[PDB]
Design a protein around this ligand. Sequence first.
Ligand SMILES: [Mg+2]
Ligand SMILES: [Zn+2]
Lengths: 87, 56, 156, 134, 44, 56
Amino acid sequence: LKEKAIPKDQRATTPYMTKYERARILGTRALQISMNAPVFVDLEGETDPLRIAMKELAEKKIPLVIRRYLPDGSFEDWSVEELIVDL
Amino acid sequence: RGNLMGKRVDFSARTVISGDPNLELDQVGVPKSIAKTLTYPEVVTPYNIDRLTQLV
Amino acid sequence: ATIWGVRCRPGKEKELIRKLLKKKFNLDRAMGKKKLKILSIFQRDNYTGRIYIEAPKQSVIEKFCNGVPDIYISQKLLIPVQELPLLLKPNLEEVALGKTVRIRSAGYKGQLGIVKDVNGDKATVELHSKNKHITIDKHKLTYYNREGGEGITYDE
Amino acid sequence: NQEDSMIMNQSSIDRGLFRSLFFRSYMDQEKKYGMSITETFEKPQRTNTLRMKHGTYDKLDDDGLIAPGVRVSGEDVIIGKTTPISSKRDASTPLRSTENGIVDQVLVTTNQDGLKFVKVRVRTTKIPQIGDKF
Amino acid sequence: LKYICAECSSKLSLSRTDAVRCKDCGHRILLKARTKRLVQFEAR
Amino acid sequence: SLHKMSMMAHRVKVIPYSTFRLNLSVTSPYNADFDGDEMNLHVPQSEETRAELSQL
RNA sequence: UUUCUGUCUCGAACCU
Ligand SMILES: [Mg+2]
Ligand SMILES: [Zn+2]
């Protein structure tokens, strides 16, 4: 059932990124780059996948999305490009 | 309580602690022996192939 | 009838019955007219660890079973009158490995050691001085026989 | 020296301050597993089918002890015992992995029952280090 | 010089399949002395 | 582990000796005293695990 | 050209 899903509008969760989302995304990109995924950024000799991940997050070039689970099972669907990673 | 809430695990060490003002706040000194035993599984990429081949 | 069942030690039941009767017969031989009132005693193999005794009053069985081991006189119970026909019914039941060596181009030179393992081009030796294992190239070590004396280079 | 640690003089340490000897003893017995069946203290060999350990065995001599004077470490075997199995298998006690040193002494005797009983004592120097407590 | 006694302080040079008693005295502790191999230490 | 900050991620510095060395100012949240105290080092085995420990 | 041993269970003493 899709009715629980919220559309791109009427989302009430914070666009400002949470530290836990930041940590999970850096880790997930870190697995992807460590296991031969394509790298979305020009590499200036960087070799640590975590550093490559931080660089991509800095440029908002991470192809990842978050279902932001409302506790009733519904979710808000938030893209990393639009998620304001201020901190 | 003894095997699920808290349990055992590898990839770990225990030893004495000494003060060290010549170490950064978020840094911790590890004995050479403890480093020799403990390992991190690192996957082979083009970006660390040379260093990993040297380590092997 | 008056029939009481007493707990006892499993597996020795016949020995208990035989001893009980020999005591009874000796008591009769010593005693005159007034005998103990024990109508009969028996056991049951498959209901092991238990004896059955008939007698009018409990004091008779106490004064019989004093001094009898392996019987729990404290543990006795009534057999119901309805239960007796069913209880009494008939139908029931590398040459360099492990050699003394001397190191020659290192800080540990002139030191005895024992070769423990060789990973190829590099021999690990436990130092025969220090409580430490060290890796050093095996070509640059002079090996010694089981006893000291002549020092042979790597040509064996 | 902080939090009630201490700064100890290295020159004093290695000129004699607070060094010590560590003696550790191990035991073995020729326990009678099977009537007319006894272990024999001897050197185990790979030729017969035994479950010997990966530690070194050259330290042993033919007698079944480690020829005192020799030293040991890690998983070197201190007493060489073979239990018959019904060819035989190893039951030798290895040295402690974390401790090592030179064998000071070895004892061979008969116990009450006449089974041979062996007591091997191993010596080490133990010098103050940072982690050592005072 | 395979073994020495504990009180007699005497060699025995015994072999396998022999009793572990001192021949000179009743005692059977039966130590044994250093190996014939060279042993080396430093002063450190 | 009486409280939250008693378990913190540190950067390894391989250091030749037999004792963990730790910066002195981190003794307060650990309630450590170097008086024979012992401490516990857990090595992560994955890029998720390292990322969590470094960022969180 | 023949390798992944291995334990429990009742306590005692000591360290932080
Ligand atoms: Mg303390
Ligand atoms: Zn003697």
